Amino acid sequence: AARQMEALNRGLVAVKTDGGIFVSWRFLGTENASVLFNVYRDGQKLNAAPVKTTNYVDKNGSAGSTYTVRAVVNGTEQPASEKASVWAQPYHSVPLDKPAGGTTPKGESYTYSANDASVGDVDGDGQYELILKWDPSNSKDNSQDGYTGDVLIDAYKLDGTKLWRINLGKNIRAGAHYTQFMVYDLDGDGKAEVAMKTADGTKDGTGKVIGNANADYRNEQGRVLSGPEYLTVFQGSTGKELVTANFEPARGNVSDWGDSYGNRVDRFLAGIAYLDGQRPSLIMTRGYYAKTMLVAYNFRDGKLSKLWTLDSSKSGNEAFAGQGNHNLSIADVDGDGKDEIIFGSMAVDHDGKGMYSTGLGHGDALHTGDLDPGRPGLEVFQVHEDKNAKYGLSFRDAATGKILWGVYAGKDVGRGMAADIDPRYPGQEVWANGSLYSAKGVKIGSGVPSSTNFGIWWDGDLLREQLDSNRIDKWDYQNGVSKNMLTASGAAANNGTKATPTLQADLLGDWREEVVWRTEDSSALRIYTTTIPTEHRLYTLMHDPVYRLGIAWQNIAYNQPPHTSFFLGDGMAEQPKPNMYTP
Ligand SMILES: O=C(O)[C@H]1O[C@H](O[C@@H]2[C@H](O)[C@@H](O)[C@@H](O)O[C@@H]2C(=O)O)[C@H](O)[C@@H](O)[C@H]1O
Ligand SMILES: [Ca+2]
Ligand SMILES: [Ca+2]
Ligand SMILES: [Ca+2]
Ligand SMILES: [Ca+2]
Ligand SMILES: [Ca+2]
Ligand SMILES: [Ca+2]
Ligand SMILES: [Ca+2]
Ligand SMILES: [Ca+2]
Ligand SMILES: [Ca+2]
Ligand SMILES: [Ca+2]
């Protein structure tokens, strides 16, 4: 059946290039193969015949010019899109209200840098707002003791209007593995809510404190190991607390999670999953090294509701322990139209049953998509941390978990990538541990892409490019070397050596993905959209069931790139029209 997706505007963007005014727009999933377009500069039509593809270069437009696009459905023109002005720079600059540094109880001062982002349409105007986590200098991996400054989540319209700031406060430790924020229209009112784990002292967008404004559950290591734990759905448009229930999976004893000093307990992941196969559910997960819990929520009709819990420590679920990554994927792997949860080396079914465990355990990178088009169903490429794992890299049937192939590594293979980078081999290539492989497992020559981080559809072809740091690279499959396509100067990635963008997403223009990177001084976010023309028209990736969810989970823990439900790549079958509705 049809999934709830977002009512998007035309996402019409206009960028000044050397070649003229590059203009792209969304091919909406509401629209048919027969939909064509007309581009208007300042009110006059630029194309003789309606164009098929959703990008256009206006060789005569200037910076002052404004663009609209008109669809042509079934013979007749449609009402104009929103007016788009031309970006003077190849990025749009979103000025941030940069929070002042602070002092921890220990006298240590910290500063803020803009960190992981997510997007939602929070005021329902058809355009994505940027939901931005601020990270304090002293933020901590679960293994490191020390106090951390307050986590701050801002929401920004692309014009730079700071809608609100949520201050998570003293009782939410700052760090990659702590706050996993879900930004999504959970209840289908066309506006996104922001849901995340909150604590006493959490100050919402209106300046209201959740729970006990004065409670301080920070232990002397600056961890928060006692005290209540909340889940708050916030109103997107105001940052107003909508509902706050107690967080699940509950902490219990720190030790249940496989250590006593407070590491494994605070290993959060979060997702959006269409578990009913139609409307989004919220997934909050705790732990992955040993004890592992996934609980599913619906936020609907102003009510937060627990859908199910999977608990590794509950009898029968033994296999589903120690399998989680610092990331997850959400997809319909059994073709039943409901989403399952690729949870590293294990998969949780749409009803919360553990489907399989490869038993290969924890890893730092996970890739779920149609990695092998010549095989029906989805494949999961996964790398594994444990040096004695049967494989360091596994390539498995996403549905059954049966390993189609793996390669024994012998060490911590800490990065893995799937992407169609080589058209000489049908499907997405995978690379980890100094070797690039075909979907079938055949080692492709020698050499790998210079990054094993993100893949991004950035240029005009169906091959995916690589993203790492402030760079987008392209794989020269014939020569076996990576080539740089973009270095975003003055922009920087986040999360140290994970070097993730603030966000990567198709959030404006055509099917290629935008990168959002904070400036070095986090005074602004830079939205880069591609100006490389493509002859391919694809539905906005944000209307792809697997991709859109992928964006929801991008921020979580160790940011993975988003994948599409269908094989998008060289020799792909014409893509399915998405089975969707908007509110
Ligand atoms: O990919 C990387 O840059 C690293 O990921 C893991 O390191 C994580 C942090 O980035 C690191 O600074 C430290 O706090 O530990 C983290 C973790 O253990 O997950 C790997 O441990 C590194 O080898 C490297 O791959
Ligand atoms: Ca909006
Ligand atoms: Ca909503
Ligand atoms: Ca399914
Ligand atoms: Ca299922
Ligand atoms: Ca790891
Ligand atoms: Ca396949
Ligand atoms: Ca390929
Ligand atoms: Ca490409
Ligand atoms: Ca785009
Ligand atoms: Ca993250």
XYZ file of C-alpha atoms and ligand atoms in Angstrom:
618
model
C 0.000 0.000 0.000
C 0.817 3.687 -0.092
C 3.147 5.177 2.454
C 2.781 8.598 3.988
C 5.451 10.833 2.521
C 5.839 14.605 2.720
C 4.014 17.236 0.722
C 7.068 18.891 -0.767
C 7.068 22.141 -2.709
C 8.786 22.039 -6.107
C 12.098 22.380 -4.253
C 13.004 24.679 -7.102
C 16.516 25.939 -6.616
C 18.552 28.268 -8.811
C 22.332 28.526 -8.566
C 24.618 30.894 -10.436
C 27.250 28.917 -12.322
C 29.827 29.949 -14.886
C 27.636 28.223 -17.527
C 24.602 30.336 -16.507
C 21.794 29.673 -14.053
C 21.564 26.036 -13.080
C 18.024 25.275 -12.042
C 16.752 22.015 -10.652
C 13.551 20.872 -9.024
C 11.958 17.814 -7.510
C 10.275 15.194 -9.619
C 7.570 14.639 -7.030
C 6.439 11.075 -6.304
C 2.903 12.291 -6.799
C 3.792 12.932 -10.459
C 3.680 10.575 -13.438
C 6.184 9.517 -16.090
C 4.171 11.718 -18.466
C 4.643 14.857 -16.355
C 6.785 17.409 -18.182
C 7.932 20.863 -17.084
C 8.303 24.482 -18.089
C 10.925 26.784 -16.646
C 10.189 30.502 -16.287
C 12.714 33.257 -15.624
C 10.931 36.313 -14.183
C 7.664 35.160 -15.749
C 8.725 34.156 -19.264
C 8.972 30.496 -20.368
C 12.501 29.372 -21.245
C 11.898 26.075 -23.056
C 10.181 25.522 -26.398
C 8.758 22.084 -25.656
C 8.056 20.971 -22.096
C 11.214 19.268 -20.790
C 11.297 15.807 -19.248
C 14.267 16.116 -16.880
C 14.071 18.179 -13.706
C 17.098 20.348 -14.274
C 17.696 23.182 -16.676
C 20.497 25.574 -17.440
C 19.365 29.110 -18.228
C 22.270 30.599 -20.124
C 20.763 34.126 -19.992
C 19.664 34.470 -16.377
C 21.393 36.831 -13.959
C 21.678 36.907 -10.138
C 18.696 39.252 -9.834
C 16.477 36.775 -11.661
C 13.729 34.718 -10.087
C 12.539 31.333 -11.326
C 9.353 29.344 -11.301
C 8.603 25.922 -12.713
C 5.224 24.794 -14.052
C 4.289 21.166 -14.364
C 2.365 20.036 -17.450
C 0.111 17.162 -16.475
C -2.163 15.538 -19.037
C -1.812 18.229 -21.727
C -2.233 21.416 -19.658
C 0.104 23.644 -17.644
C -0.058 23.781 -13.833
C 0.115 26.618 -11.257
C 3.634 28.001 -10.825
C 6.004 26.712 -8.160
C 7.388 28.991 -5.474
C 9.531 31.880 -6.713
C 13.211 30.979 -6.485
C 15.963 33.585 -6.345
C 19.459 32.785 -7.569
C 22.171 31.761 -5.114
C 25.100 34.098 -5.685
C 27.308 31.334 -4.225
C 27.350 27.589 -5.070
C 25.989 27.117 -1.556
C 23.179 28.686 0.316
C 24.339 30.135 3.611
C 22.131 29.604 6.667
C 23.334 31.943 9.426
C 23.299 30.261 12.813
C 22.642 31.866 16.147
C 25.833 30.393 17.613
C 25.361 29.594 21.328
C 27.808 31.079 23.818
C 30.404 28.762 25.328
C 30.047 27.665 28.935
C 31.789 26.244 31.938
C 31.404 22.734 33.242
C 31.225 22.256 37.014
C 34.963 21.364 36.764
C 35.933 24.903 35.677
C 36.683 23.649 32.142
C 35.186 25.909 29.447
C 33.704 24.769 26.148
C 32.596 26.228 22.836
C 29.925 25.083 20.403
C 30.262 23.799 16.889
C 27.319 22.918 14.634
C 27.066 19.152 14.359
C 24.644 16.482 13.041
C 21.553 17.745 11.293
C 18.234 16.362 10.260
C 15.467 17.798 8.128
C 11.742 18.089 8.418
C 9.034 20.299 7.100
C 8.211 21.813 10.503
C 5.773 24.548 9.500
C 4.359 22.609 6.558
C 5.299 25.138 3.880
C 6.620 22.280 1.671
C 10.272 23.057 2.390
C 12.725 21.396 4.754
C 13.937 23.129 7.871
C 17.317 22.293 9.291
C 17.233 20.651 12.664
C 20.712 21.154 13.994
C 22.474 19.566 16.937
C 25.104 21.809 18.485
C 28.035 19.988 19.997
C 30.153 21.309 22.858
C 33.956 21.071 22.621
C 33.989 18.661 25.531
C 31.524 16.137 24.048
C 32.447 12.531 24.832
C 32.515 9.037 23.398
C 30.887 6.564 25.757
C 34.351 5.263 26.687
C 35.616 8.708 27.876
C 34.865 10.162 31.292
C 34.405 13.927 31.793
C 31.629 16.514 31.941
C 30.120 17.810 28.715
C 28.381 21.076 27.885
C 24.682 21.245 27.096
C 23.430 19.729 23.885
C 21.434 22.299 21.902
C 19.099 21.510 19.045
C 18.185 24.448 16.851
C 15.669 24.642 14.080
C 16.330 26.896 11.149
C 14.366 27.803 8.067
C 16.606 28.070 5.060
C 16.282 31.877 5.241
C 18.162 31.570 8.537
C 15.206 32.237 10.840
C 16.010 30.450 14.074
C 12.598 29.052 14.988
C 13.732 27.752 18.361
C 16.430 26.228 20.479
C 15.915 23.122 22.571
C 18.478 22.964 25.363
C 18.722 19.337 26.455
C 20.485 20.538 29.595
C 22.838 19.078 32.178
C 21.344 15.589 32.241
C 21.856 14.662 28.625
C 25.540 13.927 28.058
C 26.937 15.388 24.867
C 28.318 12.840 22.427
C 27.779 10.924 19.202
C 26.082 8.014 20.949
C 23.853 9.903 23.344
C 21.281 12.142 21.559
C 19.742 10.526 18.507
C 17.133 12.891 17.216
C 14.274 11.877 14.944
C 12.765 14.622 12.854
C 9.706 13.363 11.085
C 6.021 13.981 10.518
C 5.145 11.195 12.871
C 1.431 11.745 13.109
C 0.739 12.773 9.519
C -0.332 16.407 9.982
C 2.088 17.461 7.241
C 4.404 19.131 9.761
C 7.428 17.311 11.230
C 7.904 16.704 14.904
C 11.293 16.446 16.547
C 11.530 13.446 18.871
C 14.501 12.574 21.043
C 15.628 11.390 24.462
C 15.295 14.137 27.037
C 16.016 14.566 30.725
C 15.169 16.727 33.704
C 16.259 20.247 32.922
C 15.575 19.882 29.222
C 14.406 23.370 28.194
C 12.071 23.273 25.175
C 11.679 25.894 22.456
C 9.408 28.069 24.562
C 11.898 28.148 27.431
C 9.900 25.656 29.465
C 11.753 23.029 31.437
C 10.878 19.338 31.148
C 10.706 17.711 34.590
C 12.838 19.057 37.414
C 14.582 22.296 36.428
C 17.148 21.779 39.201
C 17.863 18.032 39.171
C 21.485 17.192 38.460
C 22.131 13.495 37.786
C 25.667 13.989 36.536
C 28.039 11.690 38.384
C 31.630 12.721 39.050
C 32.720 11.293 35.662
C 30.238 13.706 34.025
C 28.061 10.799 32.943
C 24.363 10.703 33.658
C 23.767 7.188 35.004
C 20.863 7.680 37.377
C 17.664 9.720 37.293
C 14.629 9.436 35.066
C 14.987 9.378 31.303
C 12.439 10.808 28.959
C 11.345 10.654 25.390
C 9.956 13.946 24.178
C 8.114 14.546 20.948
C 8.531 18.247 20.271
C 6.422 20.416 18.015
C 8.615 21.161 15.028
C 7.458 24.737 14.446
C 8.058 26.033 17.962
C 10.222 23.444 19.714
C 7.353 23.241 22.149
C 7.185 20.021 24.103
C 4.189 18.087 22.812
C 4.430 14.839 24.743
C 7.010 13.487 27.132
C 6.884 9.889 28.309
C 9.561 7.936 30.176
C 12.333 6.773 27.861
C 12.394 3.198 26.729
C 14.416 1.069 26.494
C 14.852 1.970 30.172
C 18.339 2.182 31.612
C 17.898 -0.460 34.302
C 21.286 -1.111 35.900
C 24.242 0.245 33.913
C 25.832 -3.216 34.322
C 23.069 -5.067 32.407
C 24.588 -3.589 29.274
C 27.990 -5.208 29.776
C 29.992 -2.669 31.778
C 29.713 -0.773 35.034
C 31.358 2.553 34.298
C 28.657 3.737 31.894
C 29.637 2.970 28.310
C 27.391 0.271 26.816
C 24.300 1.535 28.641
C 24.285 4.752 26.652
C 24.539 3.297 23.154
C 21.508 4.809 21.501
C 20.194 4.442 18.029
C 16.974 5.767 16.653
C 15.015 5.302 13.502
C 11.890 5.951 11.559
C 10.196 2.812 10.322
C 6.882 2.217 8.553
C 6.129 -0.846 10.619
C 2.447 -0.805 9.609
C 3.699 -0.269 6.025
C 1.914 3.041 5.623
C 2.660 5.511 8.438
C 5.924 6.242 10.282
C 6.831 4.700 13.596
C 9.625 5.919 15.824
C 12.328 3.447 16.827
C 14.495 4.033 19.869
C 17.174 1.499 20.565
C 19.540 1.038 23.458
C 22.753 -0.962 23.513
C 24.408 -3.087 20.852
C 27.648 -4.510 22.311
C 25.841 -7.028 24.467
C 22.339 -6.401 25.785
C 20.366 -4.893 22.929
C 16.940 -3.305 23.000
C 14.746 -1.897 20.267
C 11.483 -0.273 21.164
C 9.031 1.058 18.587
C 6.730 4.044 19.046
C 3.908 5.728 17.239
C 3.198 9.355 17.743
C -0.385 9.803 16.523
C -3.430 11.825 17.609
C -1.365 13.715 20.193
C -0.472 10.364 21.804
C 2.880 8.642 22.198
C 2.442 4.854 22.181
C 4.846 1.956 22.651
C 4.394 -0.548 19.794
C 6.753 -3.304 20.874
C 10.062 -4.024 22.494
C 12.728 -6.419 21.366
C 15.047 -7.387 24.175
C 18.139 -9.517 23.536
C 18.279 -10.536 27.194
C 14.764 -12.022 27.013
C 14.928 -15.795 26.481
C 14.934 -16.841 22.819
C 16.423 -13.511 21.732
C 19.989 -14.542 22.669
C 21.269 -14.329 19.099
C 20.230 -10.676 18.810
C 22.859 -9.513 21.280
C 26.213 -8.014 20.366
C 25.080 -7.595 16.764
C 24.308 -3.880 16.601
C 26.396 -1.288 14.788
C 26.799 2.348 15.731
C 24.131 2.689 12.995
C 21.103 0.966 11.514
C 19.108 0.657 8.310
C 15.350 0.545 7.884
C 13.823 -1.197 4.876
C 11.210 -3.555 3.537
C 13.409 -6.611 3.013
C 10.763 -9.369 2.818
C 8.655 -7.519 0.229
C 5.723 -7.392 2.626
C 5.619 -3.556 2.425
C 6.315 -3.090 6.141
C 9.813 -1.944 7.185
C 12.267 -4.186 8.993
C 15.282 -2.976 10.890
C 18.743 -3.897 9.708
C 20.447 -3.683 13.076
C 24.016 -4.386 12.127
C 24.429 -8.150 11.990
C 20.811 -8.827 12.942
C 17.414 -7.856 11.572
C 14.302 -7.047 13.503
C 10.983 -7.736 11.757
C 8.249 -5.093 11.421
C 6.472 -6.587 14.457
C 9.652 -6.631 16.553
C 10.665 -10.267 16.074
C 14.343 -10.958 15.473
C 14.524 -12.317 11.964
C 18.110 -13.494 11.878
C 21.519 -12.918 13.293
C 24.564 -13.468 11.108
C 26.331 -13.860 14.470
C 29.156 -11.780 12.984
C 28.546 -9.088 15.615
C 29.259 -5.390 15.948
C 30.507 -3.107 13.170
C 30.961 0.604 12.454
C 29.397 0.766 9.005
C 26.192 -0.650 7.532
C 24.739 -0.513 4.023
C 21.310 -1.769 3.096
C 19.963 -1.388 -0.419
C 19.593 -3.133 -3.730
C 23.278 -3.824 -3.790
C 22.831 -6.704 -6.228
C 20.061 -5.948 -8.764
C 20.445 -9.394 -10.345
C 19.148 -10.855 -7.105
C 15.598 -10.077 -5.996
C 15.388 -8.413 -2.598
C 17.809 -6.268 -0.662
C 21.414 -6.987 0.276
C 23.218 -5.777 3.354
C 26.875 -4.907 3.232
C 28.374 -4.723 6.662
C 31.808 -4.417 8.171
C 32.689 -5.918 11.536
C 34.719 -4.740 14.462
C 35.642 -8.001 16.185
C 38.971 -9.341 14.894
C 37.901 -13.013 15.214
C 34.645 -12.666 13.302
C 34.076 -15.369 10.644
C 34.196 -12.425 8.252
C 35.422 -8.871 8.521
C 33.094 -7.902 5.693
C 29.843 -9.675 5.102
C 27.489 -9.408 2.180
C 24.120 -10.905 2.932
C 20.557 -11.351 1.775
C 18.799 -8.651 3.781
C 15.693 -10.829 4.088
C 17.165 -14.144 5.226
C 20.576 -13.070 6.449
C 22.181 -15.908 4.535
C 25.699 -14.751 3.688
C 26.023 -14.572 -0.083
C 29.710 -14.015 0.532
C 32.065 -12.711 3.158
C 35.781 -12.152 3.358
C 37.655 -12.961 6.526
C 39.592 -9.899 7.696
C 41.245 -10.917 10.947
C 41.146 -7.343 12.277
C 38.852 -4.438 13.149
C 37.517 -3.427 9.751
C 36.168 -0.096 10.849
C 34.740 1.254 7.579
C 32.673 -0.190 4.748
C 30.989 1.277 1.705
C 28.447 0.123 -0.830
C 27.898 2.042 -4.068
C 27.708 1.625 -7.796
C 31.099 3.077 -8.605
C 31.965 0.543 -11.313
C 29.524 -0.120 -14.225
C 31.690 -3.060 -15.383
C 29.911 -5.078 -12.718
C 26.120 -5.082 -12.356
C 25.065 -3.665 -8.991
C 26.654 -1.771 -6.138
C 30.306 -2.377 -5.402
C 31.327 -2.775 -1.798
C 34.699 -1.839 -0.313
C 36.349 -2.400 3.027
C 39.808 -3.346 4.217
C 41.785 -2.238 1.139
C 39.705 -4.285 -1.327
C 36.782 -3.306 -3.527
C 34.359 -6.103 -4.458
C 31.490 -6.713 -6.831
C 28.058 -7.468 -5.403
C 28.966 -11.058 -6.293
C 32.137 -10.902 -4.236
C 34.687 -10.827 -6.991
C 37.599 -8.593 -5.948
C 37.836 -5.782 -8.496
C 41.504 -5.235 -9.373
C 43.479 -3.622 -6.572
C 42.723 -0.314 -4.867
C 39.747 1.335 -3.209
C 38.154 4.820 -3.168
C 40.188 7.255 -1.035
C 37.220 7.409 1.374
C 35.112 4.741 3.040
C 32.564 7.116 4.454
C 29.560 8.400 2.485
C 28.316 7.823 -1.007
C 26.531 10.725 -2.665
C 24.726 11.066 -5.956
C 26.447 14.309 -6.904
C 27.156 14.457 -10.642
C 24.989 13.508 -13.621
C 25.482 9.761 -13.943
C 23.851 6.916 -12.034
C 27.119 5.925 -10.374
C 27.362 7.075 -6.799
C 30.201 9.381 -5.765
C 32.066 9.432 -2.473
C 31.770 12.008 0.305
C 34.222 12.455 3.115
C 35.283 15.488 5.165
C 34.491 18.566 3.087
C 35.108 16.536 -0.041
C 33.075 14.824 -2.677
C 35.142 12.388 -4.700
C 34.440 10.315 -7.795
C 35.805 6.829 -8.381
C 37.740 6.343 -11.609
C 36.752 2.673 -12.023
C 38.914 2.218 -15.147
C 42.063 3.623 -13.538
C 41.367 2.404 -9.987
C 41.849 5.838 -8.377
C 39.650 8.421 -6.592
C 39.300 11.914 -8.129
C 38.134 14.974 -6.237
C 34.963 16.700 -7.418
C 34.456 19.173 -4.615
C 36.391 20.549 -1.703
C 34.068 22.830 0.241
C 36.510 25.456 1.453
C 35.687 27.241 4.705
C 33.282 24.414 5.459
C 34.219 21.508 7.706
C 32.816 18.113 8.561
C 32.130 16.996 12.116
C 32.613 14.148 14.534
C 36.400 14.158 14.311
C 37.734 11.406 12.051
C 34.218 10.216 11.172
C 34.264 13.467 9.211
C 30.543 13.514 8.446
C 28.700 16.387 6.831
C 26.130 18.216 8.918
C 23.721 16.597 6.488
C 23.662 14.887 3.159
C 20.248 14.779 1.508
C 18.255 15.407 -1.584
C 16.467 18.365 -0.008
C 16.257 20.817 -2.939
C 16.225 20.505 -6.720
C 16.519 17.231 -8.616
C 17.459 13.730 -7.454
C 21.130 14.502 -6.688
C 21.905 14.996 -3.025
C 22.735 18.213 -1.234
C 25.464 18.446 1.379
C 25.069 20.680 4.388
C 28.361 21.607 6.048
C 28.855 24.076 8.880
C 31.367 26.859 8.373
C 34.575 26.334 10.351
C 33.392 28.807 12.998
C 29.849 27.332 13.017
C 28.425 30.785 12.402
C 26.587 29.301 9.401
C 25.450 26.152 7.627
C 26.208 25.841 3.920
C 23.779 24.019 1.704
C 25.583 22.768 -1.367
C 23.486 21.595 -4.281
C 25.037 20.215 -7.458
C 25.124 22.204 -10.688
C 26.191 19.272 -12.814
C 23.372 18.587 -15.306
C 21.882 15.134 -15.638
C 19.764 13.580 -18.384
C 18.176 11.426 -15.724
C 14.886 12.247 -14.115
C 14.288 10.473 -10.832
C 11.697 11.064 -8.180
C 13.085 13.134 -5.349
C 15.009 10.688 -3.189
C 12.980 12.057 -0.264
C 10.008 10.197 -1.796
C 11.923 6.964 -1.927
C 10.739 4.790 1.000
C 14.265 3.614 2.037
C 16.153 6.863 1.331
C 13.813 9.181 3.157
C 14.049 6.996 6.271
C 17.787 6.935 5.702
C 17.853 10.709 6.137
C 15.928 10.430 9.394
C 18.663 8.133 10.730
C 21.653 9.926 9.212
C 22.480 11.852 12.378
C 22.297 8.829 14.624
C 25.535 7.594 16.211
C 28.041 7.051 13.398
C 26.412 8.697 10.424
C 25.863 6.396 7.476
C 24.946 7.528 3.971
C 21.322 6.992 2.811
C 20.420 4.279 0.288
C 17.491 3.916 -2.059
C 14.971 1.086 -1.983
C 15.600 0.274 -5.640
C 18.935 -0.086 -7.419
C 19.865 3.397 -8.544
C 22.931 2.908 -10.689
C 24.269 1.965 -14.110
C 21.813 -0.317 -15.906
C 19.068 0.176 -13.346
C 15.577 -0.803 -14.482
C 13.369 2.299 -14.897
C 12.584 3.213 -11.323
C 9.199 2.303 -9.818
C 6.766 5.213 -9.340
C 6.666 5.527 -5.546
C 3.560 4.127 -3.928
C 2.839 7.107 -1.662
C 0.369 9.701 -0.415
C 0.906 13.023 1.363
C -1.406 14.578 4.014
O 36.186 6.008 11.797
C 36.872 6.588 12.665
O 37.337 7.738 12.571
C 37.173 5.840 13.937
O 35.971 5.171 14.388
C 36.154 4.537 15.661
O 36.560 5.575 16.577
C 35.470 6.224 17.273
C 35.815 7.704 17.415
O 35.810 8.325 16.122
C 37.184 7.830 18.121
O 37.638 9.190 18.180
C 37.097 7.214 19.529
O 36.370 8.030 20.440
O 36.456 5.892 19.538
C 35.266 5.708 18.716
C 34.876 4.222 18.722
O 35.637 3.428 19.295
O 33.825 3.871 18.153
C 37.251 3.460 15.588
O 37.525 2.958 16.903
C 38.545 4.057 14.969
O 39.540 3.048 14.755
C 38.234 4.788 13.653
O 37.714 3.875 12.679
Ca 8.842 23.743 6.433
Ca 3.561 16.234 12.643
Ca 9.103 -5.835 5.174
Ca 8.147 -8.252 7.765
Ca 32.392 0.136 16.788
Ca 19.161 -7.387 -5.014
Ca 28.330 -1.498 -10.551
Ca 26.848 9.989 -9.964
Ca 18.762 17.696 -4.895
Ca 26.117 11.132 14.636
